[PDB]
């Protein structure tokens, strides 16, 4: 099961991630900087963005979501409840369940048999070296290169400064002396078209890394540690997990702001085994990109399903013309 | 000489007390690449002159000078004879060399 | 065998192959610097690289993904299957395959019929004094002269700085003197336009190095030990094994960056036997002297066979345009 | 076939004939004093060097790769077959044929008759007195003068770090009890322009040293002891063999770095008897020495064929332009 | 030698007992070539002066000693007063000795 | 004399029982003929300070000792009154002898 | 006394069972002009240590002795106090003198 | 009797078979009239052993003798309290002696 979605969004007057202007009134959303052909030499330029460390906690915080109300939701450390980022510390020679079990960080078989987020997300304690790589990848957030390319300028920051004002049990707007918390506090919002290569590897949930695989007799076999039915409860929440993606439920200061979404156009491919990762919607080209290799994909034979919304994707390959993004997950999840 | 008051100013703008923060036209000052970008953010820096006028007297600070007419009139050529951003760099620079100053504003 | 890749790729929002500081909060990414003419005398210039090992261990860890699925590939080492770069330590004399058979560390034509991994990418023992040369040699990822000629400055590092955070049951933050594991570090990030010119000599695949050629009568024969047909599947999943090469799995920190990939244009150059190694595509002419040095290969009486992505390579010169990657794979393996 | 070749290269991001380190996790490149006039007084700088060893043992490789193919190609010695550079040493009474044939170490008129390698390159057996002079002369591989004489520093060593991290069935990095193979291995790399100025007297090939010239009656013959055929294959694999050397197959440590190599420009020179050696590359005004060495010799009675590439050399001496190395090499294959 | 003072500030960022730790100014200023880049950095490292003010009295330490006047109208002939790059690095990573030692700064 | 302090630094980040391997920077120390890359040098050892200070306790020894900062206010006027390099070698070379031995580093 | 630990720490450089032979370092610590010549020639010997190190465990041979820091600081003290070029020709070719002995080690 | 043993090392150098001669050194070691010139003189005696000691095996007699460290440091303790020549000249003609006697080396 690996899946591989992207497209292009919009994101409108939105402060997600921002770099917080180095710990000051004036805080300012991070940028990052990206070349473009301008059919005159690659030049660079500056443009705000989403990093994908983002992308990948609210990844477990959707997976979170969407497992606790299965009915094998009791297998989660206690600080996935409370949206821990952090899967294991320093000085943290054990772990604690939501139900207060304690957990050793040796033969990490156990470890992927009673915890469900380091299975997914992976984990590392440094005391005992034991490692996990992250069964899902995140693509960074930048703006569509079309898009950059056409604005030529329009920073794309509004610097909107929001102030808070208190006084105290008089009524009194104070001076310095008192302090009174009186500060300025602007914020800059960012506005555009971006693009989203989010993808996820499910074929080894579950199966530990030492040994993915075990032979009986010259035979391979999934070494599946957990019973079945939860390593398919594990892959339904994950596959659900992206529905508070597409639908505005990313970024810092969700409460303030909760930015303007709305998916413009997408192209997923499910498959059974390993795939080509299918290429970022940061290029303006990427649409004959992704039919060239889907179709290239059928030709040498891979059983890939493919998957458009707003994306024309020719007329001879097989493609399901998808209506929303939480019937998709719907698609996706009957194949199991 | 000549760069001691508009930094005198622009340090002015931002220190101790003087509870008005705009980090962002200093920082487009000094970072800016053309005649355009230093022209606006000298405007926007001196947008600024009538609510520091206004604050000197509410915490009883001593007046701020105002920059002449004669600094930004002379910069209106010093600025307008160059043809590579290399050259106007560390004009911004020096437009920013008193811009964090342990100056004594608010003796 | 002997396939030669050259080619211009575009990469954005990465911070592959970092050296991590060794364990500080501020990492940085591999930096190494080269000579342009610049037409006014030759300069050197620091820019981020990525150095060979990372496209090596990669290729490894491919060519074993896509390996493990063919029915000969139970013969494949035991920590191969956890995408281990290790071969061999310095004093074990025995390893351990994938259905934990033991093999020994002497007499390499046995070692390379019972480990395929280890035939392809070679491997030393110091104990007991074997050795096998490398037959997959990776080059660097470069930015391009043309590109690196017409930015004069812009460093394109951003150094985006991202923390973690960690709260007990509680919800504390906690302070220093409880620890908590609350760091908050950086990362540095990196985009331009790179060259690859990464070379197989899959000729040799099973042959053992003591022995290349067999003399029955005055007659050479190749020395293979392997079946026929096992050797076939050792050819096509190491030349399967470039699909995710240019997908954009190469690197580190893949689970949260998974660079913006895609693939500017390529030539390729399959041939029989040995032949000139392809020019990198650093440089800003490489066009024309791979143009002319295919032209009097062909001439001179070589089997020279060669595809090409989004360049010219003139009209006097066949060639087959391919209008992807693994369309490309799909051609190397059509003569088997 | 007294032929001479020396050039400009563009040798980047090489780790080319190491110091090796001797064991300290930190090995350095080679390093060598090059005097310089500066305009103000001979001073000597440090420089980054690949000794003509490496440029003779990869020109062995080539053309035993190259003499393989030949039907005549079970003439060699059996470790040449896998690159031994080694001929005799310490007592070596006997020698091995390619097919198993036992060869003696006395009248060395047969020794070249049966092992082309030992007749091209040379050897020498301390326990008989027989020995040869190699037919191939190679000269220090050093960057140019002006190029360091306009890089005022810069040392060009950027000292990257590697790792290799090994991880057990339980998945845990260990300590030095189980020694867990964990080490850092740095290596310094280097980028310039350097030169080279590889010289072939193959008109000697095939004739012992002892006697080189028979008279008849009072008229000299060349004393050829292998068939005319054998001597014309021979000469026509140590021409090829320059193939893999301004390819990119020079050096060592070929598998992880593959240096990006480029030919700047070249000189060639082929005659039919004695002539000057060519000048080297390294020196700013090479060309000019050049155009006054082959016109003074053209005009003193010598049958001088110049090639070049890259350099003008006037008009008034004809030249031909190649526009690679390998039509250079069938343009010295059609004048055999 | 008005070194001292802006060392003691260039270190104060970097130095252990605060919660700051970003030392990509230093590395900056480290590497400087050109007139522009140097004073650049070195400003980008002032401009966290007062993180470093509102910080200091969390953790009851003294607050930090912001460079004096005199060291920055020092600085300035004593850049320009050069040509030669030769002689521009030794004063464009002479700060640095000082960000990294092992005095008392928070008593 | 303010060299054996300085030596015990660059020993710690050469000396065993440690993960980090730096030869290159007691290199760059050794053979480094002029006054600006032996600053250089002094740089390059002294970068990585917070690396040994939160790797000394990892395995329990106590941790390293920086040279004082009278140690640092000496070598700048030790330096400056070398004028021939003739002498500018032999504090480099003893500095750099002081970076190998075979002391108790830290138990 | 004092100098036969260095002595033999030369002579494992260049004694049998350990395949370095550095005829070179040895020869440059014997012939010295000048005492900055003769620490550069003792940096180079001393700078092969860690080889030797685990060159020693390598085959289960014992570990040789480095030099201590006061037999280092002592060597110093006495560099710089010889001043012409007669005793420090004396003292250059005493410490090299039995790097080609007949010691007993790596038994 | 610790000056036979010196004496048969130095008449390895010349005497039958032994296929390199070095008179040169021996006559050094005799002429030598500062007790410095007699401390080349031995170290050039000395710097061919390797010589010798792996080319004694290529003919298969008896490998020589090369000096034990105890009786070089004696050599060189005695160094130091000959403040005459008059001295020097009968112990390096002692020493230089045993060079040309009837040593039976390897038979």
Redo the contacts between chains.
Sequence with gaps: MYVRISGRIRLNAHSLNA?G??????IEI??????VRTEN????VEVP?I???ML?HWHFVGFVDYFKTTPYGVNLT??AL?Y???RF????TTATKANGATVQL???ATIIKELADADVH?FLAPK???????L?????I?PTEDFIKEVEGERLIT?IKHNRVDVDEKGAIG??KEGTA?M?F?REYATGLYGF?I?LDLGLVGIP?????K?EE?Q?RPNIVIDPNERKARIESALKALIPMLSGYIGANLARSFPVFKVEELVAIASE??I?????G??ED?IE?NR??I???R??GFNIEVFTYNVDLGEDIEATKVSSVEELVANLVKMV | GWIRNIGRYLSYLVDDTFEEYAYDVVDGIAKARTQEELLEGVYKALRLAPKLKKKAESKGCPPPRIPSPEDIEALEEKVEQLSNPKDLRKLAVSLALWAFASWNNCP
């Design positions: 770099q202007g180095g710990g000051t009134n004036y991070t940028k990052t900087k990206v070349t030499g690659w030049t660079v963005a990093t994908g460390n990948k206690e600080r409370r821990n980022g952090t510390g320093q000085g943290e040796n033969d990490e992976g005992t070296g034991r490692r996990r790589v992250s899902v990848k995140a693509s960074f930048l610097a001076s310095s009186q300025l602007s290569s993808v890394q030492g040994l993915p695989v032979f010259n391979p085994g390993p080509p990762a299918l290429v970022h940061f290029y990427y990109a060239s290799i179709k290239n994909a030709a040498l």
